[PDB]
Amino acid sequence: VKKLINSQISLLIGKGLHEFDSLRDPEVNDFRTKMRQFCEEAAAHRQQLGWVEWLQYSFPLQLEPNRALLVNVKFEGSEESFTFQVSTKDMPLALMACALRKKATVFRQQPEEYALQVNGRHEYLYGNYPLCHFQYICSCLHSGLTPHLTMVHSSSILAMRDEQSNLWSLEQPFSIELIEGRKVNAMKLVVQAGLFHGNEMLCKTVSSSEVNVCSEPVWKQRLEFDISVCDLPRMARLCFALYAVVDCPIAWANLMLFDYKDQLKTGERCLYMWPSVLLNPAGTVRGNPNTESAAALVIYLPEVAPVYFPALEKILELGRHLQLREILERELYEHEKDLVWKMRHEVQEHFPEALARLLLVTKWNKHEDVAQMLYLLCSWPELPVLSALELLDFSFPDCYVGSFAIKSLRKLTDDELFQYLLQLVQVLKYESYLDCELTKFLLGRALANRKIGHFLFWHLRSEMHVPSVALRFGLIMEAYCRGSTHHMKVLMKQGEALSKLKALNDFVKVSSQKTTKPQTKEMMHMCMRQETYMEALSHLQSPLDPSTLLEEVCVEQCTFMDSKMKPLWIMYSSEEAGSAGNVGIIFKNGDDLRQDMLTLQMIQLMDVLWKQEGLDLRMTPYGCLPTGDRTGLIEVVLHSDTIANIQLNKSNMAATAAFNKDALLNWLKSKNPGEALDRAIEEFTLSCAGYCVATYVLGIGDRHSDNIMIRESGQLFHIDFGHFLGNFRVPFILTYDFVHVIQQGKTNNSEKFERFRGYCERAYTILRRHGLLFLHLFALMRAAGLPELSCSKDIQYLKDSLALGKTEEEALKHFRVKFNEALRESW
Ligand SMILES: CC(=O)Nc1nc(C)c(-c2cc(C)c3c(c2)CN([C@@H](C)C2CC2)C3=O)s1
Numbered sequence: 129v130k131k132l133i134n135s136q137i138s139l140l141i142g143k144g145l146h147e148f149d150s151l152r153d154p155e156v157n158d159f160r161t162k163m164r165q166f167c168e169e170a171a172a173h174r175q176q177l178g179w180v181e182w183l184q185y186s187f188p189l190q191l192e193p194n195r196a197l198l199v200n201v202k203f204e205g206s207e208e209s210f211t212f213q214v215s216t217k218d219m220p221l222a223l224m225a226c227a228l229r230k231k232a233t234v235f236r237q238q239p240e241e242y243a244l245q246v247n248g249r250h251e252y253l254y255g256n257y258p259l260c261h262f263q264y265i266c267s268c269l270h271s272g273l274t275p276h277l278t279m280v281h282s283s284s285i286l287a288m289r290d291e292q293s294n295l296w297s298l299e300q301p302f303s304i305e306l307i308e309g310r311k312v313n314a315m316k317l318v319v320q321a322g323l324f325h326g327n328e329m330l331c332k333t334v335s336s337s338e339v340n341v342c343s344e345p346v347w348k349q350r351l352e353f354d355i356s357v358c359d360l361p362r363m364a365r366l367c368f369a370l371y372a373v374v375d376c377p378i379a380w381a382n383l384m385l386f387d388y389k390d391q392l393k394t395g396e397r398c399l400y401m402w403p404s405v406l407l408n409p410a411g412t413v414r415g416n417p418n419t420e421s422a423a424a425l426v427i428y429l430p431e432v433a434p435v436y437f438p439a440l441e442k443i444l445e446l447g448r449h450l451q452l453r454e455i456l457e458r459e460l461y462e463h464e465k466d467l468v469w470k471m472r473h474e475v476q477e478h479f480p481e482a483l484a485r486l487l488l489v490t491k492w493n494k495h496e497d498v499a500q501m502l503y504l505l506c507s508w509p510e511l512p513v514l515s516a517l518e519l520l521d522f523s524f525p526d527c528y529v530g531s532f533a534i535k536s537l538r539k540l541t542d543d544e545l546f547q548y549l550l551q552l553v554q555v556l557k558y559e560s561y562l563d564c565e566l567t568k569f570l571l572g573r574a575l576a577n578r579k580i581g582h583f584l585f586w587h588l589r590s591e592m593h594v595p596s597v598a599l600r601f602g603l604i605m606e607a608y609c610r611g612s613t614h615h616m617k618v619l620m621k622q623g624e625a626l627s628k629l630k631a632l633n634d635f636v637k638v639s640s641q642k643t644t645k646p647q648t649k650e651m652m653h654m655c656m657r658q659e660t661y662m663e664a665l666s667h668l669q670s671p672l673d674p675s676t677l678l679e680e681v682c683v684e685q686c687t688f689m690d691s692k693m694k695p696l697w698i699m700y701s702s703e704e705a706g707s708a709g710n711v712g713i714i715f716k717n718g719d720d721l722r723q724d725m726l727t728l729q730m731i732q733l734m735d736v737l738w739k740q741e742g743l744d745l746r747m748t749p750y751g752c753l754p755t756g757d758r759t760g761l762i763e764v765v766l767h768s769d770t771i772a773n774i775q776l777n778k779s780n781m782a783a784t785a786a787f788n789k790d791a792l793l794n795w796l797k798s799k800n801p802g803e804a805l806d807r808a809i810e811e812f813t814l815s816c817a818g819y820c821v822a823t824y825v826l827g828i829g830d831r832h833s834d835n836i837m838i839r840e841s842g843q844l845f846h847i848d849f850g851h852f853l854g855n856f857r858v859p860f861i862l863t864y865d866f867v868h869v870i871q872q873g874k875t876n877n878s879e880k881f882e883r884f885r886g887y888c889e890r891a892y893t894i895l896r897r898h899g900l901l902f903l904h905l906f907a908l909m910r911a912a913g914l915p916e917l918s919c920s921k922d923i924q925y926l927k928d929s930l931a932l933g934k935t936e937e938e939a940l941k942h943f944r945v946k947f948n949e950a951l952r953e954s955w
Pocket residue numbers: 689695714716721724725750752760761762763764765766767768769846847848849
């Protein structure tokens with residue numbers, strides 16, 4: 129059983145646990161033992177949670193960022209149910225009271241003993257919130273559906289819990305010996321070397337002498353750096369770059385000068401290098417695992433003796449010892465930097481949220497100054513979440529700064545954590561050591577919230593094919609599995625389904641090139657009807673949303689789309705869920721989805737920020753999740769079609785039109801007869817404004833009818849981008865056919881069109897006020913290595929699009945010019 133769990137973890141993470149042992153790495157060994165203990169302690173705490181607390185762990189509340197409605201309620205094991213009329217302002221407890229009173233009269237004879245389950249879902253309604261604060265209830269109101277809920281007793285919840293159990297003296301200049309290499313190229317070879325603290329250099333870079341490409345090259349020369357050994361900061365990074373010249377990049381490699389035990393490193397080191405696109409300080413500090421083919425560089429760190437980095441007590445001991453200040457404190461010159469450092473005590477006392485700027489002006493290549501910074505840091509007041517997100521960036525590489533950022537981030541709600549989880553996982557790629565505060569923070573939150581654990585796992589699992597993170601991410605996942613053996617098995621079931629979908633999709637790719645679609649579709653179904661497929665594809669939690677249950681696969685309704693990669697369309701049904709159980713997922717394999725996944729998350733964030741200000745633009749933040757190498761799932765939006773399909777203006781249809789411009793409007797009329805047409809045009813108008821502003825801010829062009837879809841409700845959404853941040857300055861885009869629907873099919877309708885302009889302006893001004901949040905998240909995403917999110921010019925695009933330099937009046941003026949130009953562009 130102990131053996132079995134190891135084999136199950138190995139299969140789940142895609143890497144045998146035996147491979148960790150074979151490295152013979154003390155840091156790996158210590159990480160595994162320490163974090164296993166940490167995660168098993170979390171498990172012990174979880175298994176003794178009270179039933180309400182377990183609900184909060186397993187089914188965390190999905191809330192939104194008077195009026196009457198019908199609700200159907202039943203009891204766990206019963207066919208019979210009661211339809212109640214309640215108010216939107218009523219609490220769950222009031223609803224549960226009604227249910228128990230009805231049961232008492234039917235059975236002929238305590239609300240606090242119950243929770244309301246959403247039928248056929250792992251989602252619950254509970255707590256002191258009015259019904260309309262829950263996302264499920266709001267979803268039902270907007271779609272006009274009846275909520276269906278099930279009374280679940282505390283003893284049933286506890287049964288779920290139970291079944292799911294488990295130094296300063298060294299003044300000489302820092303130097304190294306470059307011994308030799310082992311490589312392939314066409315010229316002479318040169319090794320550039322630099323000391324870095326994050327992005328900034330600790331001193332000038334030093335080059336090696338030119339040697340012929342011959343060999344297996346040899347140098348055996350000392351490289352001496354312009355910085356004392358006592359002045360090396362704790363997180364000092366020695367970076368190398370091999371290239372050829374008569375420029376031709378070949379390889380690079382980094383390492384930390386101190387090890388994970390705070391000891392200065394000696395002596396000889398073999399650096400297995402990574403291939404280049406000269407210095408790359410943000411690159412990983414672990415060697416290339418492919419030692420067969422990787423070019424190596426052997427070096428010698430001199431035995432200066434055993435020296436450790438000074439402890440915090442010694443650090444603090446050493447350290448213990450105006451209008452224009454404000455005018456610059458909202459890139460700065462030499463005298464301005466000195467002003468800030470001079471008045472660093474005043475920054476702590478009066479301007480604590482300017483810590484970042486203070487950290488950027490401190491001299492990290494002088495230990496007394498670094499010291500002087502850390503004493504202020506250790507009594508620095510906790511900062512808001514927004515400030516802490518900036519501090520996670522690689523520009524702030526110091527470990528005490530990192531620890532301070534995490535300390536300020538502990539007040540993140542689970543909802544905020546979920547929202548920023550993609551970025552936080554990517555920040556792990558900047559980390560220097562395995563055991564770190566970010567990893568412990570994420571694991572802790574993941575074990576305290578099953579939904580966070582679900583998405584943490586998949587973000588990590590989806591990058592196990594990347595050699596530079598496979599070890600780190602594999603270890604984190606192993607640790608998590610030690611924390612929840614039950615959830616490990618739940619995730620294995622998802623993995624087994626995805627394995628079958630990959631095999632099925634490979635068949636479809638081959639088959640689609642050899643026969644007709646009806647024939648490929650029929651053989652797809654025959655493959656799915658195999659017992660191994662029916663079993664593997666049925667009865668699992670959706671990777672897109674663990675609260676969504678994918679029960680019985682509806683083979684007859686499964687198909688594939690015509691796009692190059694032939695993405696699979698998989699439909700499900702659930703008797704217990706009813707119509708809400710009718711859900712679809714798309715499996716797509718062969719394309720890099722990461723950039724589009726980022727775009728969708730950012731649109732999702734925009735939607736939350738708008739709703740927080742009482743602006744609902746009726747967006748469609750459909751689920752999207754990377755699951756493996758160029759593989760991911762997409763949540764199907766049902767009852768929708770492409771603008772292209774509708775604009776074909778097919779005959780013998782309700783949408784058929786006298787002019788092509790009326791095709792969209794006629795389609796909406798057919799789906800929304802009578803008085804319902806007005807709401808659909810509004811839903812269309814609102815969503816159009818949302819996506820117009822979203823694509824403008826994110827710099828998304830290439831917008832055509834094949835990549836835009838419309839729901840029968842009228843809601844417009846996008847299914848391909850991407851292509852963002854001006855990576856084909858993209859203008860604001862207004863399409864004539866959409867303007868036509870907004871104007872109710874009329875040629876002149878300023879009333880409706882200017883309302884639409886108002887929505888766009890309100891949406892735009894709200895995003896400007898959270899401009900810094902976007903900049904900080906995108907900064908952290910530079911860790912991901914996306915082709916179109918590589919440098920400062922990509923970040924600069926957002927500053928320009930949100931006009932953060934300008935005042936609100938100037939920015940709004942500037943936005944109105946872009947809107948008007950887009951209006952003129954429309955025919
Ligand atoms: C009725 C109907 O077809 N409803 C639909 N709803 C959705 C949500 C559809 C959809 C389909 C596909 C093939 C994709 C997307 C969305 C988004 N997207 C990428 C940009 C993301 C993976 C990164 C796709 O590849 S199709």
